[PDB]
Design a protein around this ligand. Structure first.
Ligand code: PI9
Lengths: 99, 99
């Protein structure tokens, strides 16, 4: 689909059998989801943003369905203000910026 | 043009007569520019992101050329690690996300 930017680009995703709302963020290298229970092992990691660094749990090879499109990749879980779909998964669904 | 997301979507912008590289960021509500001595009146503001909040100076109606496309709107100036073009200016150049 073609999404305009007058409103935040929020979309429903399905992760771990659960539905959630997430922001398609071209300015994010990675995908960071609010604290939740995800199956499998996770490694501790730190990611940075505008205000500094936060500690997150890194899950590898997790299936994520974004607006009906499938992706499988790394998902970081931690204290983020909003669920974020970053470039690692946006590239898998073939998302591009157009103007 | 069509910009893929394999790499950070950085482009050249023109602001205050200067050329800078900035990130096309669909996850940023407003545009945030690295510290620069822009003339004009401003209002203090706090914006929060992953690691927390930072204090910025809000300037209104600042002309910004993005990849040869003219836009004009609010620009926040503060200690950001990178120049960020947000939805407030992206909507002006007709930018969309497509997949
Ligand atoms: C939705 C919310 C959690 C985040 C909104 N933000 C935009 C988001 O795209 C920001 C933009 C940004 C900030 C710093 C940076 C690189 C990009 O370099 C440092 C080095 C860190 C780069 C790694 C990275 O991509 N970090 C992402 C994170 C969400 C995975 C990130 O914070 N992306 S923001 O904090 O930069 C921001 C907030 C408010 C306004 N108005 C503008 C920008």
């Amino acid at each position: 689909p073609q999404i305009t930017l007058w409103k935040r680009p929020l979309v429903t995703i399905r992760i771990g059998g659960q539905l959630k709302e997430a922001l398609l963020d071209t300015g994010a290298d990675d995908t960071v989801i609010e604290e939740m229970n995800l199956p499998g092992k996770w490694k501790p990691k730190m990611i940075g943003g505008i205000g500094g660094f936060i500690k997150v749990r890194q899950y590898d090879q997790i299936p994520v369905e974004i607006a009906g499109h499938k992706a499988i990749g790394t998902v970081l879980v931690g204290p983020t203000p909003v669920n974020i779909i970053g470039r690692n998964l946006l590239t898998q669904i073939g998302a591009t910026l157009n103007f």
